[PDB]
Design an enzyme around this catalytic site. Structure first.
Site, mmCIF file in Angstrom:
data_model
loop_
_atom_site.group_PDB
_atom_site.id
_atom_site.type_symbol
_atom_site.label_atom_id
_atom_site.label_comp_id
_atom_site.label_asym_id
_atom_site.label_seq_id
_atom_site.Cartn_x
_atom_site.Cartn_y
_atom_site.Cartn_z
ATOM 1 N N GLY A 204 38.872 35.953 22.279
ATOM 2 C CA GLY A 204 37.638 35.272 21.920
ATOM 3 C C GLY A 204 36.893 34.743 23.129
ATOM 4 C CD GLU B 85 27.063 55.261 50.185
ATOM 5 O OE1 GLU B 85 27.781 56.274 50.060
ATOM 6 O OE2 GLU B 85 26.804 54.743 51.292
#
Ligand SMILES: Nc1nc2c(ncn2[C@@H]2O[C@H](COP(=O)(O)OP(=O)(O)OP(=O)(O)O)[C@@H](O)[C@H]2O)c(=O)[nH]1
Ligand SMILES: Nc1nc2c(ncn2[C@@H]2O[C@H](COP(=O)(O)OP(=O)(O)O)[C@@H](O)[C@H]2O)c(=O)[nH]1
Ligand SMILES: Nc1nc2c(ncn2[C@@H]2O[C@H](COP(=O)(O)OP(=O)(O)O)[C@@H](O)[C@H]2O)c(=O)[nH]1
Ligand SMILES: [Mg+2]
Lengths: 430, 49, 126, 437, 11, 426
Positions: D144, D254
């Site tokens: 949770g 990249e």
């Protein structure tokens, strides 16, 4: 420098004063002989506020013990700390008043007030700078309820500027041991409100309830009640006697405590009261101290504060500690019980601190309150007094002493007007 | 401990008179023993006669 | 009573015998030899680090759990499992492949304005 | 200068941080105290240990992480662990109560108490860093806290830093084994924020590392620590180009450019090679072709899916250790000459090759034997969406009968968010199908 | 700085 | 920080709670004096969930003991670990209920409830962050089945968010020691269903059944029954006090076992219950426990789960192992006994592991399951209660308390409605 003169009137006042002198002699390390055998230097630094110096390194209590009956003086002299009091300080008549306020105040009081004034003037001119007078009596006596108020009048004429405080024993409606008790109460309360800077109302029924439940003692003698009253009276002046982080005194509390001169009646309370069974399971902290002094059961008076509004509250702490738990706890006890505090005064709580703990314990706290609930007990004294007076009963004993009929009427009118303005101050909008 | 454990073993509601007296007997011992240990802790040196 | 005596309940006060008779090791005393000293000889001071005098060791004061895990041969705490045997020797660290800032360590200097004056003592002899 | 910030949230995030920070410290030579035995002075590489650690006035090195938990003990074990003085105290942030496997509780009721504290801490680390590369954020979909607080925190970070990239590493609920019964609701509700507020995410299921650890590493009795070590080694393989030099160094931007064809498709799968024990490593020679063939085996995938059932869109090779570009080219030719491996028609060239120098190290108490070369693969393909499909099936079987809805409703969210997130995941699966066409 | 006890008290 | 208040009502709950406070004192290392003689400092890190602190390293329990009769108070007052409790927490009345629910719930109830709120309050603000309330009672008494339903009613109004758990003891029809037992129980079950987050049903008859066959003890006293209940309560909270690989709390399970607010009755189980002679022929392994709680003979209540569908299942393991096989054994038992699980909830089993093992045995697991078998327990009460109520037998005692006859029909209607919707979920 800042001295206190202890006035002691009546049988009840004599006994509680004996207990109080015993307790403060324990705190200052004074033997029944008169010598100092305490250990710390601070135990003898401000000893001159209750004690006068005598040759041979002796200290004599600065108290005046007055009674119209010579019997109680024999008991006082036969007590444990009985020979510590100077014999010349004992002022006693030959016959008492028999619970008659008029006999105490007018007929037989007139002969002895001269002697009391003589010894009081000698005592007052002893000290260089006197803070004031601290008196102990009962409003249900013949002398303390009687000639004690006359002495209050004469002294308030003599020394107007000095602070005088009365630790007054107020009769209970539930448990009563005199029938002209309402008569003496209504003829005394008028005098106290006319000239009193602060009254502390103590009730034997409330003290007995404390003995029954809080400490769970099986045979509570009057020594228990006098010990508790002595603890309260010490805790009032510990800050004056000893250095603290935030020092104070009688004027410090009184000026902060009296918004209006007619309102000077206060209920006291002592925090660290636990049964010997309860000592084992406890974490002694400022939280629990605050909880115990703010529960209404621990109250020393015969009035539940939950039916009124707390006008002002003062807490004097004894022992070493950090301020932050106090300031946050007074803040949150102000915050939760918002209904029980008045809205026209912010920060109803005043706090004072003394470093030196009481003997045999590490922390303690004394609570002095001005709350609206105290007008209840006054109205019940009125309910008794009017019911007795309407049939003109028990008046011949008084009327034989030479006073009129209008003094009862004006005393009742005065106390009715007092409870009227008290209720109108209860019912106030910001 | 045994006095206090006896004090601890004690009934919480004490209605009878022979209970009410046997509470005190322990407290008479309880005050006595506490008094003795208090005074012997006051100093390490015991000059006695 | 003897019949009211239980059928399988055998639980003493929680003290173990030798280190063999324990899931743990390092048996020691309670630390208190007289409950009169325990109850009565309480402390006048208040420690500022703790907000409650009763909560004496709320902030891990004087507790050595890490030391006890390193003492005991096996990590009972399963998170103490993930780092235990770092003390044992491992393959020497390879260092030659790692960036170094030549530009900042050479081009950029602090002060000393060298061009204006060269009257220095024992210098410019390369 | 290259710096990356850790936002570990949840019990999974904290334990992964434990493993990863141990790996970084032994990679760089940091003692557990916070002083390396030789800093600067004798040579000294300043750029080596400033991607993760920061220097203090006393010459100690502070990790660039934030440990957040709404339950105390998981971080208390770290506060009392051997790295107590290594970590910063105010860095470790705890809460009095947790979400109790409730996304709604971790998102709307309890998270807002400490969201300001964690964001100010993160702002302080962003002040400390000069050139910030990205945030690596570690959490799980089931828990949770690890779902709700993670979602709210990254949706705050999206408006706090528009450009600064976010790498989300998360535990994907497994197809069969499960540690909760309310986890499909939390995963479905997390997926919206993970779609709209992420650039690259690495959802992994525990069962794959379980079976890989059993088969290849021969450990019959695996634990969570081994999985955490493998995940930390994957992260170290990712960050090796930032930490150490190479022939073809690859920045995070990249492969962000060269892994994401369309903005909605940012869910790659990561793999590591080789993973063998020492006893079997005694006998088998290790080379580039063999390790890169081990990468393409569907049994070595960290996610339960078969790439043979889908089609590769992009693939990023990160070679590390003693590797040679000729062998990389030979391996890539060998891989391209296989019919079993499929590629989309709009990507004839689907490879991003990077090469480093320093070999991976081995962690004390670890499992992997030392191997002088290693490789990581990041594959964007369409075979992943079937896991979303089966999760949708589980959610639908939950949601037909309104099970466990009352907890969330009493928390106070609006119920059509469930169907809205279901529709969003259906649309995402549809988009993956469109690319598969 | 010394405790003094009587013989009866000590007994 | 995370605290539990342990209420105590009725003679049954007082003895159960007395046994429980002994057991966890033997886990955290507390003598009957009340000092910490523990060896591991891990034993003293989280002791403030159950214990309050006092001067000199004294630990007092956070338990409020209530009963309408002072006689049973002296019994626990005379117990072995009777010395730790605080007498201020001892609040009690003078006259008992005579096993009359309406006397407890209404007549003798109003006077003593006010006293117990103050202490229940007093412990509540003592803790900074209280997780919720714990209460032990029997559903067949006059106080615990009576007063006890009144106490939980008030505190839910006063603390709505806090979780309340109850180790309520459920009567058996096969072995019954009360004849107005259907009357007080049917008037109690209505109180639990409207205000309870989680309920555990425990039956003494099945506890006797385990002692007779699983343990084969010659003379099981009530002390052995209480410890077996007590060990389950310690198995509930072992992950709260001590850290473990997959930590959990009472709320970690609470959301996980409740699909709909009406269904909160569960099946507590204890794994390592072996006979005395069996320890010789034994080799402690994880699948042995897995075989041990998934037989219905280990169940501590009086309904066979083989006659219903398991809605939710939890197995909280306590001790050190690793998680891989326990998931396999979770998966093995789920695929094997597929019929007895519901189809609409795949992965019915939630697992948690705490590292610290119990004293006396390395391996312990607590099984908490919600199955359709519990509907066989309410129906058997209505079979008795309606037989009582059709003839209006034993009614003047309850009618003497001033309450109407409408309360009987609604309580039956609510439990009939409860088992009706419980049947539609099968
Ligand atoms: N790989 C891995 N997964 C973990 C680890 N710890 C927990 N998990 C996963 O996290 C899921 C639950 O989330 P947790 O991290 O345990 O707890 P949380 O994130 O704080 O959220 P809450 O459960 O509500 O408190 C479980 O289903 C586990 O599969 C770990 O150390 N490694
Ligand atoms: N609290 C307390 N009250 C006392 C004590 N001794 C006497 N009294 C009260 O004093 C009242 C009687 O006062 P009294 O002797 O007539 O005073 P006097 O006429 O001035 O001497 C009684 O109602 C008692 O309740 C005592 O030791 N403690
Ligand atoms: N499990 C268990 N049950 C008990 C124990 N003592 C009593 N009981 C049960 O409690 C029931 C009686 O409870 P009772 O004293 O009337 O409760 P009260 O009216 O609330 O005080 C009986 O049916 C017993 O079966 C015990 O030690 N263990
Ligand atoms: Mg968690």
């Amino acid at each position: 420098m800042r001295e206190i003169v202890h006035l002691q009137a009546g049988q009840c006042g004599n006994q509680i004063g004996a207990k109080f002198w015993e307790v403060i002699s324990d705190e200052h390390g004074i033997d029944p002989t008169g010598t100092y055998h305490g250990d710390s230097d601070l135990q003898l630094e401000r000893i001159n506020v209750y004690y006068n110096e005598a040759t041979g390194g002796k200290y004599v209590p600065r108290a005046v013990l007055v009674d119209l009956e010579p019997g109680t003086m024999d008991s006082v002299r036969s007590g444990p700390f009985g020979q510590i009091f100077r014999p010349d300080n004992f002022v006693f008549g030959q016959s008492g008043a028999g619970n008659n306020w008029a006999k105490g105040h007018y007929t037989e009081g007139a002969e002895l007030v001269d002697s009391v004034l003589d010894v009081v003037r000698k005592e007052a001119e002893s000290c260089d700078c006197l803070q004031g007078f601290q008196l102990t009596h009962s409003l249900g006596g013949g002398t303390g309820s009687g000639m004690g108020t006359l002495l209050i009048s004469k002294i308030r004429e003599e020394y107007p500027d000095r602070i005088m405080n009365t630790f007054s024993v107020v009769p209970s409606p539930k448990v009563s041991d005199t029938v002209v008790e309402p008569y003496n109460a209504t003829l005394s309360v008028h005098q106290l409100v006319e000239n009193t800077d602060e009254t502390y109302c103590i009730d034997n029924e409330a003290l007995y309830d404390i003995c029954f439940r809080t400490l769970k003692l099986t045979t509570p003698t009057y020594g228990d009640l006098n010990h508790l009253v002595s603890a309260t009276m010490s805790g009032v002046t510990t800050c004056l006697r000893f250095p603290g982080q935030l020092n104070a005194d009688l004027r410090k509390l009184a000026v902060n405590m009296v918004p209006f001169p007619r309102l000077h009646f206060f209920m006291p309370g002592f925090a660290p009261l636990t049964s010997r069974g309860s000592q084992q399971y406890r974490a002694l902290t400022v939280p629990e101290l605050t909880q115990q002094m703010f529960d209404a059961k621990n109250m020393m008076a015969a009035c539940d504060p939950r039916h009124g509004r707390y006008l002002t509250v003062a807490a004097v702490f004894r022992g070493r500690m950090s301020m932050k738990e106090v300031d946050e706890q007074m803040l949150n006890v102000q915050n939760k019980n918002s209904s029980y505090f008045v809205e026209w005064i912010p920060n109803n709580v005043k706090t004072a601190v003394c470093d030196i703990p009481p003997r045999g314990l590490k922390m303690s706290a004394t609570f002095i309150g001005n709350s609206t609930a105290i007008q209840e007990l006054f109205k019940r004294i009125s309910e008794q007094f009017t019911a007795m007076f309407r049939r003109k009963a028990f008046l011949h004993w008084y009327t034989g002493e030479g006073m009129d009929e209008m003094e009862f009427t004006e005393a009742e009118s005065n106390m009715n007007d007092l409870v009227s303005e008290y209720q109108q101050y209860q019912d106030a909008t910001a | 401990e045994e006095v206090h454990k006896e004090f601890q073993s004690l009934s919480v509601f004490i209605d009878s008179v022979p209970k009410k007296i046997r509470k005190q007997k322990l407290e008479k011992e309880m005050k006595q023993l506490e008094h003795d240990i208090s005074v012997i802790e006051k100093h390490k040196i015991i000059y006695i006669a | 009573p003897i019949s009211a005596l239980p059928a399988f309940s055998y639980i003493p006060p929680r003290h173990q015998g030798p280190k063999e008779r324990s899931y743990f090791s390092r048996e020691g005393q309670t630390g208190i030899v007289s409950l009169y000293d325990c109850v009565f000889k309480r402390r006048l001071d208040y420690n500022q680090k703790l907000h409650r005098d009763d909560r004496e060791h709320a902030k891990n004061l004087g507790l050595h759990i890490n030391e006890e895990e390193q003492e005991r041969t096996v990590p009972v705490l399963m998170s103490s499992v993930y780092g235990k045997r770092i003390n044992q020797p491992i393959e020497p660290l390879n260092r030659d492949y790692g960036h170094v800032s030549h530009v900042k360590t050479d081009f950029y200097r602090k002060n000393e304005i060298p061009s204006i004056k060269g009257p220095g003592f024992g210098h410019i002899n390369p | 200068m290259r710096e990356c910030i850790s936002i570990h949230v949840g019990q999974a995030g904290v334990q992964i941080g434990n493993a990863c920070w141990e790996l970084y410290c032994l990679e760089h030579g940091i003692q557990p105290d916070g002083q390396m035995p030789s800093d600067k002075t004798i040579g000294g590489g300043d750029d080596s240990f400033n991607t993760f650690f920061s220097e203090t006035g006393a010459g100690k090195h502070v990790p660039r992480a934030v440990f957040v938990d709404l339950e105390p003990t998981v971080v208390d074990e770290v506060r009392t662990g051997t790295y107590r003085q290594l970590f910063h105290p105010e860095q470790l942030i705890t809460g009095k109560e947790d979400a109790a496997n409730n996304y709604a509780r971790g998102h709307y009721t309890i998270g807002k108490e400490i969201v300001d504290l964690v964001l100010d801490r993160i702002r302080k680390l962003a002040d400390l860093c000069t050139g910030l590369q990205g945030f690596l954020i570690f959490h799980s979909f089931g828990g949770g806290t690890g779902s709700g607080f993670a979602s709210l925190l990254m949706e705050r970070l999206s408006v706090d830093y528009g450009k600064k990239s976010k790498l989300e590493f998360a535990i994907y609920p497994a197809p069969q084994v499960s540690t909760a019964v309310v986890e499909p609701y939390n995963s479905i509700l997390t997926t919206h924020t993970t779609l709209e507020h992420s650039d690259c995410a690495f959802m992994v299921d525990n069962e794959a590392i379980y079976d890989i650890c059993r088969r290849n590493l021969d450990i019959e009795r695996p634990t969570y620590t081994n999985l955490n070590r493998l995940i930390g080694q994957i992260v170290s393989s990712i960050t090796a180009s930032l930490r150490f030099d190479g022939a073809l160094n690859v920045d995070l931007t990249e492969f962000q450019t060269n892994l994401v064809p369309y903005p909605r498709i940012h869910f790659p799968l990561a793999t590591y090679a080789p993973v063998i024990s020492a006893e079997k490593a005694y006998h088998e020679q290790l080379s580039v072709a063999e390790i890169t063939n081990a990468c393409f085996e569907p049994a070595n995938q960290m996610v339960k899916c078969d790439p043979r059932h889908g089609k590769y869109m992009a693939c990023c090779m990160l070679y590390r250790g003693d590797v040679v570009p000729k062998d990389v080219n030979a391996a890539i030719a060998t891989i391209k000459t296989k019919r079993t491996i499929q590629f989309v028609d709009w990507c004839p060239t689907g490879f991003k090759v990077g090469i480093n120098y320093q070999p991976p190290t081995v962690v004390p108490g670890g499992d992997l034997a030392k191997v002088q070369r290693a490789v990581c693969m990041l594959s964007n393909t369409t075979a992943i969406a079937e896991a979303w499909a089966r999760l949708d099936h589980k959610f639908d079987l939950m949601y037909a009968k309104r099970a466990f809805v009352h907890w969330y409703v009493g928390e106070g969210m609006e119920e059509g968010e469930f169907s809205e997130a279901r529709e969003d995941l259906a649309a995402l699966e549809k988009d993956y199908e469109e690319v598969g066409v | 700085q010394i405790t003094i006890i009587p013989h009866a008290e000590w007994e």
